[PDB]
Enzyme design. Structure first.
Site, PDB file in Angstrom:
ATOM      1  N   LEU A  14       0.821  -1.216   0.000  1.00  0.00           N
ATOM      2  CA  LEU A  14       0.000   0.000   0.000  1.00  0.00           C
ATOM      3  C   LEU A  14       0.861   1.275   0.000  1.00  0.00           C
ATOM      4  O   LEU A  14       0.624   2.196  -0.790  1.00  0.00           O
ATOM      5  CB  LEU A  14      -0.963   0.014   1.200  1.00  0.00           C
ATOM      6  CG  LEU A  14      -1.949  -1.145   1.398  1.00  0.00           C
ATOM      7  CD1 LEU A  14      -2.425  -1.212   2.841  1.00  0.00           C
ATOM      8  CD2 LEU A  14      -3.125  -1.046   0.446  1.00  0.00           C
ATOM      9  N   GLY A  15       1.856   1.318   0.889  1.00  0.00           N
ATOM     10  CA  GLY A  15       2.775   2.448   0.984  1.00  0.00           C
ATOM     11  C   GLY A  15       4.161   2.068   1.476  1.00  0.00           C
ATOM     12  O   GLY A  15       4.396   0.932   1.908  1.00  0.00           O
ATOM     13  N   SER A  16       5.082   3.027   1.413  1.00  0.00           N
ATOM     14  CA  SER A  16       6.470   2.802   1.824  1.00  0.00           C
ATOM     15  C   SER A  16       7.096   4.080   2.388  1.00  0.00           C
ATOM     16  O   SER A  16       6.765   5.192   1.966  1.00  0.00           O
ATOM     17  CB  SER A  16       7.291   2.284   0.643  1.00  0.00           C
ATOM     18  OG  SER A  16       8.559   1.817   1.064  1.00  0.00           O
ATOM     19  N   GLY A  17       9.794   1.659   7.148  1.00  0.00           N
ATOM     20  CA  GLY A  17       8.857   0.496   7.060  1.00  0.00           C
ATOM     21  C   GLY A  17       7.797   0.598   5.973  1.00  0.00           C
ATOM     22  O   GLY A  17       7.689   1.621   5.290  1.00  0.00           O
ATOM     23  N   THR A  18       7.014  -0.471   5.817  1.00  0.00           N
ATOM     24  CA  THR A  18       5.975  -0.551   4.779  1.00  0.00           C
ATOM     25  C   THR A  18       4.603  -0.941   5.345  1.00  0.00           C
ATOM     26  O   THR A  18       4.512  -1.618   6.372  1.00  0.00           O
ATOM     27  CB  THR A  18       6.346  -1.576   3.665  1.00  0.00           C
ATOM     28  OG1 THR A  18       6.252  -2.912   4.181  1.00  0.00           O
ATOM     29  CG2 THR A  18       7.762  -1.333   3.131  1.00  0.00           C
ATOM     30  N   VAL A  19       3.540  -0.521   4.663  1.00  0.00           N
ATOM     31  CA  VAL A  19       2.188  -0.971   5.010  1.00  0.00           C
ATOM     32  C   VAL A  19       1.630  -1.858   3.901  1.00  0.00           C
ATOM     33  O   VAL A  19       1.628  -1.479   2.728  1.00  0.00           O
ATOM     34  CB  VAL A  19       1.222   0.204   5.379  1.00  0.00           C
ATOM     35  CG1 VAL A  19       1.047   1.191   4.220  1.00  0.00           C
ATOM     36  CG2 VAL A  19      -0.136  -0.328   5.858  1.00  0.00           C
ATOM     37  N   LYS A  36       1.303  -2.949   9.287  1.00  0.00           N
ATOM     38  CA  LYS A  36       2.488  -2.109   9.290  1.00  0.00           C
ATOM     39  C   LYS A  36       3.718  -2.977   9.627  1.00  0.00           C
ATOM     40  O   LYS A  36       3.767  -3.600  10.687  1.00  0.00           O
ATOM     41  CB  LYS A  36       2.318  -0.957  10.285  1.00  0.00           C
ATOM     42  CG  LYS A  36       3.538  -0.064  10.430  1.00  0.00           C
ATOM     43  CD  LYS A  36       3.330   0.965  11.521  1.00  0.00           C
ATOM     44  CE  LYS A  36       4.590   1.771  11.772  1.00  0.00           C
ATOM     45  NZ  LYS A  36       4.293   3.023  12.521  1.00  0.00           N
ATOM     46  N   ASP A 123       0.031  13.676  15.159  1.00  0.00           N
ATOM     47  CA  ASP A 123       0.249  13.496  13.713  1.00  0.00           C
ATOM     48  C   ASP A 123      -1.071  13.607  12.958  1.00  0.00           C
ATOM     49  O   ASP A 123      -1.305  12.891  11.986  1.00  0.00           O
ATOM     50  CB  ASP A 123       0.911  12.148  13.422  1.00  0.00           C
ATOM     51  CG  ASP A 123       1.739  12.161  12.126  1.00  0.00           C
ATOM     52  OD1 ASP A 123       1.898  13.231  11.488  1.00  0.00           O
ATOM     53  OD2 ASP A 123       2.211  11.082  11.722  1.00  0.00           O
TER      54      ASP A 123
END
Ligand SMILES: COc1cc(-c2cnc3[nH]cc(C(=O)NC(C)C)c3n2)cc(OC)c1OC
Length: 264
Positions: A14-16, A17-19, A36, A123
Site C-alpha cells: 500500500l505504501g512505503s 517500514g511498509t504498510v 504495518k 500526527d
C-alpha cells in the site's frame, strides 16, 4: 494482542517500514487487515503505538487487531479500503461539500474522544484519516501519540511542522489544543480536496507567516462557516483556542444545518 503468524496472509504494498494489505483468519471469519511492517528504537515505537491503540475504543479511530513477530515486527489493524483522505479527495474531485463536512465532523468526534481519554495524537493530518467508505472516516497513525500524565495537560518532547501549533514549535509542548490546531490544517486539506497546506513554503517560512497573524486562505467552494471554524482552530493562544468538545459541537450543528437544506 499476540497473533499467530500462520493465520496471517500478506500480499506481495500500500505504501512505503511498509504498510501491506493482508488477511487474518479470525474466530470464524477471515478479516481483511492492514499490516504495518518494520525495516531497537524502531521496535519499541511499534509496541508503544500498539499500547495506545489498545486503550482506545471508538467508531472513528482505527482498531488494532494485534502485534506479530516473524520476518519483521508487524502491527495488524483493521483495513480502510478507500485509504487516506487526502489521496481520496485528490482522485475524487466531485465529492460534495456536505460529504466533506460529514467526514471532518467524524474526525472531530474521534478527536473529542481522544481528548476525553487524555491522549494527544501529534500526527493529525488528512493523510492519517482513512476512509472505510465515502461516508465513514477513522483516525489512524498513533506512532507519535502520547498518554498524558495524570498531573499534566501537555506532553513535553522530523516533525510535520505545517500541522503543528506555535506552542509545539516554540515550547515543544503538545496538548489536545495542539491537536485542535492540526485539525484546522486537516480541515483546510479536506476542503482543498487533498492539496498540501502552505504550498511552496518551508517550515521556517510557515512559522514566520503565523507569527505575523496570517492564516491560509479559504479553499474554493468552502463555506464561510467552516473557514471560520478553521481560523478558530488556528487561535495562537492555547487558552483561547477551543477544545475538541467545542469543535465537534460546532461541526455537529453545521452538519445538521446543511443536511436540513439538502431537503429544503
Ligand atoms: C487503500 O489505499 C491505502 C490504504 C491505506 C491503509 C488502509 N488501512 C489502514 N489501516 C491502518 C493503516 C495505517 O496504519 N496507515 C498508515 C500508513 C497511516 C491503514 N492504511 C494506506 C495507504 O497509503 C498509506 C493507501 O494508499 C495506497
Amino acid at each position: 494482542v499476540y497473533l499467530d503468524r500462520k493465520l496471517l496472509t500478506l500480499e506481495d504494498e500500500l505504501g512505503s517500514g511498509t504498510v501491506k494489505k493482508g488477511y487474518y483468519q479470525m474466530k470464524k471469519v477471515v478479516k481483511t487487515v492492514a499490516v504495518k511492517i518494520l525495516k531497537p528504537a524502531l521496535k519499541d515505537e511499534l509496541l508503544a503505538e500498539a499500547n495506545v491503540m489498545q486503550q482506545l475504543d471508538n467508531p472513528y479511530i482505527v482498531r488494532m487487531i494485534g502485534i506479530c513477530e516473524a520476518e519483521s515486527w508487524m502491527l495488524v489493524m483493521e483495513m480502510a479500503e478507500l485509504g487516506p483522505l487526502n489521496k481520496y479527495l485528490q482522485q475524487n474531485r466531485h465529492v460534495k461539500d456536505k460529504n466533506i463536512i460529514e467526514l471532518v465532523h467524524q474526525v472531530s468526534m474521534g478527536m473529542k474522544y481522544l481528548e476525553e481519554s487524555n491522549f494527544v495524537h501529534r500526527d493529525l493530518a488528512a493523510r492519517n484519516v482513512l476512509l472505510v467508505t465515502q461516508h465513514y472516516a477513522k483516525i489512524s497513525d498513533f506512532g507519535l501519540s502520547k498518554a498524558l500524565r495524570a498531573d499534566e495537560n501537555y506532553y513535553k518532547a522530523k516533525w510535520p511542522v505545517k500541522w503543528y501549533a506555535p506552542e509545539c514549535i516554540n515550547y515543544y509542548k503538545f496538548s489536545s489544543k495542539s491537536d485542535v490546531w492540526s485539525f484546522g490544517v486537516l480541515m483546510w486539506e479536506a476542503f482543498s480536496y487533498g492539496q498540501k497546506p502552505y504550498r511552496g513554503m518551508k517550515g521556517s517560512e510557515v512559522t514566520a507567516m503565523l507569527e505575523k497573524g496570517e492564516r491560509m486562505g479559504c479553499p474554493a467552494g468552502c463555506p464561510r462557516e467552516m473557514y471560520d471554524l478553521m481560523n478558530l482552530c488556528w487561535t495562537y493562544d492555547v487558552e483561547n483556542r477551543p477544545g475538541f468538545a467545542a469543535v465537534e459541537l460546532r461541526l455537529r450543528n453545521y452538519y445538521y444545518d446543511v443536511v436540513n437544506e439538502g431537503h429544503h
